[PDB]
């Protein structure tokens, strides 16, 4: 999600205005102003594609943040950036392995909170406590408080 959310933040106002015009086509006549599988299917067919009901439900589930079963405009912008890549290929595991070693300052095999904090400060961006805590919670999937090698690869998946 994070790489796509960043791409959305960076869209210009004119680009968002064009996406809004497209969104309005998709939700024309919808009871709640949102895109359900009935509006998504009618547009995909209008576009020449023939998705199954399951494919349509999965396209919505991939960006549905509230659990509404529908796509709102904010969710739509994520759908539209996900449908395109600037970040093609996305590197690979061998390159992430060498980068992992650079985060692991004590060479223990894990990235701890102090290591993460040192690396974040080095970026030059203002780092708040919330930036540190949130990235470590996003990375450490087993709740030990550290990022292992396999968690690191999931953590940096798709990051250019």
């Amino acid at each position: 999600d994070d790489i796509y959310k960043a791409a959305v933040e960076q869209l210009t106002e004119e680009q968002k205005n064009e996406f809004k015009a497209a969104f309005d086509i998709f939700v024309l006549g919808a009871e709640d102003g949102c895109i359900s599988t009935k509006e998504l299917g009618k547009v995909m067919r209008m576009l020449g594609q023939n998705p199954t009901p399951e494919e349509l439900q999965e396209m919505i589930d991939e960006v549905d943040e509230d659990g509404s079963g529908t796509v709102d405009f904010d969710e739509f912008l994520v759908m539209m950036v996900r449908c395109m890549k600037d970040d093609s290929k996305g590197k690979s595991e061998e390159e992430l392995s060498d980068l992992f070693r650079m985060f692991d300052k004590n060479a223990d095999g894990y990235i701890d909170l102090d290591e993460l904090k040192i690396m974040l400060q080095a970026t030059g961006e203002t780092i708040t406590e919330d930036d540190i805590e949130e990235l470590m919670k996003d990375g450490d999937k087993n709740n030990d408080g550290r990022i292992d090698y396999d968690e690191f690869l999931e953590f940096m998946k798709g990051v250019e």
């Binding site: 006549g29 359900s36 599988t37 009935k38 509006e39 299917g41 009901p53 349509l56 439900q57 079963g69």
Partner: protein
């Protein structure tokens, strides 16, 4: 009268089909959501089956 009646019969039919289209589309989304829920409840109980089975 036949092309106009036709147009009106067709508008009536088109409307019946349009409503059926939207009715079936809205209800499809719901039927899909029931399938998601049906699969969801299936997974909750099937997962319990797996958990209980694992135990």
């Amino acid at each position: 009268d036949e092309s106009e009646r036709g147009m009106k019969v067709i508008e009536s039919r088109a409307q019946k089909d349009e409503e059926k289209m939207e009715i079936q589309e809205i209800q499809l989304k719901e039927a899909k959501h029931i399938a998601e829920d049906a699969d969801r409840k299936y997974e909750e109980v099937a997962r319990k089956l797996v958990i209980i089975e694992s135990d």
